[PDB]
Write a protein that binds this ligand. Sequence first.
Ligand SMILES: Cc1cc2nc3c(=O)[nH]c(=O)nc-3n(C[C@H](O)[C@H](O)[C@H](O)COP(=O)(O)O)c2cc1C
Ligand code: F3S
Lengths: 153, 1472, 116
Amino acid sequence: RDRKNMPGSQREVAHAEEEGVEFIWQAAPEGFTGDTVVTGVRAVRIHLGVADATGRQTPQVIEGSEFTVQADLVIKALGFEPEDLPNAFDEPELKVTRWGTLLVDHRTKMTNMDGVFAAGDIVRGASLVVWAIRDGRDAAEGIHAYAKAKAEA
Amino acid sequence: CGVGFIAAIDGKPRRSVVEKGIEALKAVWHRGAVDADGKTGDGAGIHVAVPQKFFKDHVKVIGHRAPDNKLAVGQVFLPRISLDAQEACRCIVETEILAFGYYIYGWRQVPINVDIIGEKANATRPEIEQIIVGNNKGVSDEQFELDLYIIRRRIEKAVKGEQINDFYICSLSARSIIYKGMFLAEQLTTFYPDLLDERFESDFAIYHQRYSTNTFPTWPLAQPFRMLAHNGEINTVKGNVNWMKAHETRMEHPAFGTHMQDLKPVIGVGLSDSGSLDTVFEVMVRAGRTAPMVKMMLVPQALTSSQTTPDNHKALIQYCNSVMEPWDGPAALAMTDGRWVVGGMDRNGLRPMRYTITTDGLIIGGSETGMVKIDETQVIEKGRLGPGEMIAVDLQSGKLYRDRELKDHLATLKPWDKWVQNTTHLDELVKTASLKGEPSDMDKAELRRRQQAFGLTMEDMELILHPMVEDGKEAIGSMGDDSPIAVLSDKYRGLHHFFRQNFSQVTNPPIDSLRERRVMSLKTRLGNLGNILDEDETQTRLLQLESPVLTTAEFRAMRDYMGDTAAEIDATFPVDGGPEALRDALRRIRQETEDAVRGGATHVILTDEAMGPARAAIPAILATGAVHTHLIRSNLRTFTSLNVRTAEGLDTHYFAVLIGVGATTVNAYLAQEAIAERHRRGLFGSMPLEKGMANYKKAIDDGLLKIMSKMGISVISSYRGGGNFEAIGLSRALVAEHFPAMVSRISGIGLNGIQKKVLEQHATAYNEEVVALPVGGFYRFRKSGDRHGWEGGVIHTLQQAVTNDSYTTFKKYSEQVNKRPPMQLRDLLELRSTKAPVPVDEVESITAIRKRFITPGMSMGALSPEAHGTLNVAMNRIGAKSDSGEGGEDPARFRPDKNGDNWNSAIKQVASGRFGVTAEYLNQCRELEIKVAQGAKPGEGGQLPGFKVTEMIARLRHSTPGVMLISPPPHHDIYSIEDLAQLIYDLKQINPDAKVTVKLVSRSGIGTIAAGVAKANADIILISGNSGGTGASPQTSIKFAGLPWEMGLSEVHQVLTLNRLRHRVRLRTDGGLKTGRDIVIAAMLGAEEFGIGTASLIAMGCIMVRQCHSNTCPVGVCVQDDKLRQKFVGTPEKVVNLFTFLAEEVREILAGLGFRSLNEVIGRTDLLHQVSRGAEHLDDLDLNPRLAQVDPGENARYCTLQGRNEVPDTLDARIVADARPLFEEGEKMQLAYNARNTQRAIGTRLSSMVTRKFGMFGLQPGHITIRLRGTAGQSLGAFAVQGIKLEVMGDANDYVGKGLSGGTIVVRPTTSSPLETNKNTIIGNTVLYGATAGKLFAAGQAGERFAVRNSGATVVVEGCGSNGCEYMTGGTAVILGRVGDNFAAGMTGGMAYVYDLDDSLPLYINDESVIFQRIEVGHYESQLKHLIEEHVTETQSRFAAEILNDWAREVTKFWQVVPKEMLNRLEVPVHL
Amino acid sequence: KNGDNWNSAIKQVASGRFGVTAEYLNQCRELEIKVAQGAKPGEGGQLPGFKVTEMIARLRHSTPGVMLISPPPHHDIYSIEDLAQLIYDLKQINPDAKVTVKLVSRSGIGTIAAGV
Ligand SMILES: Cc1cc2nc3c(=O)[nH]c(=O)nc-3n(C[C@H](O)[C@H](O)[C@H](O)COP(=O)(O)O)c2cc1C
Ligand code: F3S
């Protein structure tokens, strides 16, 4: 993608550029050339269309521009997805959406079955730390309310 | 006026369809003709499906039992006056329906409301009833419809048997019904309240409203008809009825059976064109075909010789063109089979048709894009219909077929490829024809003796034949026709002189033959006719020729191919036969032809080579007419052909009339003999004989195309045998007996006079020794030749009288003029009153008469600046009006000079080219004028030679210095009478003070057209004659086109008095006025103002040199050179003296008769008597048809009202009420309103105010801006000036940005629309017609003829249609999409950029005057960059933004189109 | 020159009479008498001492760098005959403009509006 759409911060890119990094914007990996260990990365160059009526750009690969960069150690930093919780927690009744982040109500942050709560990073995605703190405090309030309503009756 | 249709795609009935149809009919009241009564309309109709539940409930209520199968209902118009003819009609209907076996349920009286019809549409109102027929036999539905059709046909025949009038059957079916009448468009659901019921639900609906040209409505003439609805007019109706009469004698189909005998006269009597086309359409549909196939066969597509279409479609169109003759004319059709619903266009695409698809499975098509109200968030695709396209809906399957998909689905039924290959061509046979057997050319003596027998002079070969062989194009003349008419001459005038050509007035546009040539064909087919109701291979086996004219070698090859199947007929009569030898010869040949055709012959060759010293040659026209008519009336024409070998054909007018009378092919061998004999003497130079013959045939073909194009007929097949001419000087009996369908208003010489002329000329040729042909004077004056209107002594006497200022010399001139033998129609008339003479000093003053004369328009291109200025100074001095003609005028003369002269012109013209029409040129006059046709050349554009266009005229017309300028024959703005009404509305909005004048040319049938344009709020009609001068025009159009003004004026006066419309308009005439006697006669016939023209030029020095086109006029009248313009000797005093003498003569005549004013004599026809030339000429001319005196009534016989005819007020009024601080202080404003398609000329009156206040360029760009939301109407912002910015959210209908003069128009889709901007039509037809400056940014696709006659505007659109940038003259235009065929036709100025992806521009462009390349200079890339950036900024598009984003890779996709004439004139060259 | 017109159509006659001249009243289409503002009724508009630059000081005919606090009353309108007299004066000085009275919502505004 382009520079102004980096999902992180903007001072970090300036610091990295000052420390000695070379960036290559709008490039997608196509293949790895080598024999037993990687020796280079053959990549292409994509082109971004204009923003649609909703706010999303469509990329298209340029057929002519293809290059190869010399690489001795490649590091994949694609992303992260949730794990298979219902099949790893012996409770296959957890309500779970497509991506894997389980579903909770907005007020009490309670999962499908009563008593079990879940809030934090497994609910949002690739969120930040302050979002996690907020989710944790909300889950704490909800757990306290539920525990009181339980212990009374 | 307007037609439209609505259809549910899935094919399920619902009330919304009928509701939307009624809503759409409720909103077309602005294109129709208003009336002072308010209740009188001229027609309306709707066509829907049968609501079975309604009629079944009615039948249950009566007491019967509702059947299971579908019920049938018929609607009938019975007589209303007599209560007995109703019973006879009912008896006939009931005894015919019960003859097949069906069960009749009963009759029902349709409830109506008569309180809303006018006074004239109510006196002829019929009694409306319905009959209910049920299918008890259990037969199928298709057989039910066939039986109902046969029943209706036989009922019509029966009721026509007993001569009962006012009977009609609007519909008889079990599927659809028609509600039509002569009420207003919006008052339909009030007259017929049944449609307000909740049970009327259908799955399709059609609606139509018309615009009549007379005021006598007849209910059975309103549309829609049974299975059709037509908007426009058909050109070839007199030619198609004949071929239908010929086809009827062989067609048969096993579906009808014996009842086929009751279907023989398929085209009834008393119908219109859209009724005849409908009848043939229905009889073709009922026999097995479907609506798309019948549409393809009747109104085909343009068989272009390009590779842009697959050859499957090519084979299909080839078969369809070979099977049937086309039905031409402007036409938008919305037809419906029992199953399909089709909407289609004609070959040229002159009428508009726009459609819209919604998400509810609904398609809505019509003439405007805002008739029904639809929210923008529910449309799927907007579109249009190109020329020849069509769009269909299949209801039985529920599918929507667009153009190409329908073509592909239709090209899969029959293997057309294996069928088409049965044809054979001719050039192959001419090649395999070995170059042996060339006969010997005739001897010089024989050639001369054969040429003298027809009256061919030496100027016929040195003036009109040498250019043909030399260059390949017809000659050019430079002055009007002043020769006597054919019947009043004394020399030998051939029979082809008595036939004048025809043309098309406002009701019908001509066709440009120089640019739109790709849609005109000259194919010919021998052995073509057959059964048109089968599908086999024998229908496509024939001989095919590429031109109806043939040389001698080609004719010999064709004869060898024909062999022993042809029959040669002699066409000579004995010179010693007697007084009735010609009649006996005609009978002999017309009997031998029938005897030979029945004997198995399939080719008739009419040769007259047997002409000798004892046998004269029958005129070929009369012979071929007799033979063709006899073959038509004997049911034999469909078997054979008719080839003619004539010895008189020399020019392109003879072949025209021979082919129009009915001949198939024409071979002229004497012209070829003369060509060969002139070549062997070494006159052409070095070109071979084959080159001469090729050039001659090319000239003949182009002349035929030009002659056939003056009417709108674009195919030779539908023009032959139609008789598109007018006979002047021939007997009524002879014309009605030998010629198929022509009018001869006044009678003429019979057969005896023709025999006398022929025999006398033959004796002169064969009884004396000829040594050389006579010199002959027909185009130029010679002492030996005929007489002329302008001779030497006349001219010199007039000039001396005008220079020396002596009334006696002018009286001598007038006497010399009025003492010659008769030469025109007004010479056989005589004035004779019965009162007593009055003293001369009592008649009106000379001033009050001089203020009735004007001078007609003479363009500054033809005249010199000095002569134009002199005429304008002279006329503005005495108080009368002048005219500027086409070509604009100089703005610097918009003020009186220091001495007191006024070099302006009180009447501005609006020509076809829109040559100088701006917003200030229209606000500096007192009367506007719409030139439809000129006196000399009708149905054709004015010409201007290349060298005549100097730098001054180039700047004056905004063109390229030194290039030929030919106006387009049509207007591109007047395609029907409603278009003329719209243009008159525009012209009355731009100038709130002027009067609109319409200029016509006399012919047959001009009365109805004049009565039509009188309802369009025009107040002055101009009837030009056939003898009007010109600056440049061909000879065939000068001598053989038009009619004397005495016929046209006398017909228009009567027709206007008959419709109670004469008291509203003023009549004006011109053409051939020389003395005061002619003025008094024209005033008696009905005219009120008079045009002089040529005589004025003679007062200033013109001596009839007739070299105006060559730019070397000696006296310097019509020249643009300097050293010749130094020889001008004109003076305004001369013109003043001429007009003074002319007025004094009229005063003298009026005093001699006994009246005291020109008002007392206007219309008084009884003061004119006819006197015969004598008892030795024996011409049976009866002028009584023009002497008929209709009684006016209580109104006067002339205009009795002051001021112009006012028009309803548009939106602009409100705007003028709001933008007051702009006119009082001059401050920026900003307004917003709502636009609707019933609001025409949005922003034109404001333009007039701004032009009058600040001028065309007084305000900065964007001083006042208006924001409209919705569908704007027609003529959006016409004639807007700089400082006005209209911004439309939605779409505009038509004529957007017409005559733009510096303003700004922005059109973009709404924000809440899910539509791709580059895939939906946003504007309509004829965009930026003749603009001179400004900008226009649209965010969609344009329509048809995009940016025609552009001169200074810069436009950016995301698409186009056919014939884009036609005849563009200046400015830049960017097109971000595909284009149509014939792109940049006749372009001669400017530049174009096209964003082409599929690499298809070389297939669509017309590479004749332009070159297309890739962009190579950065100076030209910066222009495109800035243009697209401004487009993105103004319209906020997304496609253009995407293009601008990827600039480096998309700059290599643009094609740059540059004219050929601007390759060495640009500052920065386009090459490296 | 661009057509922009910076003038105003409604002039105010406040309690301070800071710019009311014989020309300031002949350049409008409607006059206005401000009796009380909506935010602070029964009080005069304020302006801090440093908000009065040289332009505002020369335009209001005051001293640069001085806190301006308008008098809560008008010293002209003590009762309703006084307001009638003021309206008469305003309609006399300008023969084409109208006069509006700006009030504030409270109880008893009905009788006061009927009196105005
Ligand atoms: C040199 C010349 C130029 C003309 N130009 C025009 C023209 O531009 N537009 C037009 O409507 N008629 C034009 N006319 C025709 C005249 O307007 C008028 O119809 C004609 O001269 C009448 O013929 P008359 O003078 O014999 O009576 C022209 C005629 C001549 C001789
Ligand atoms: S007829 Fe024409 S060529 Fe000259 S002399 Fe008269 S302007």
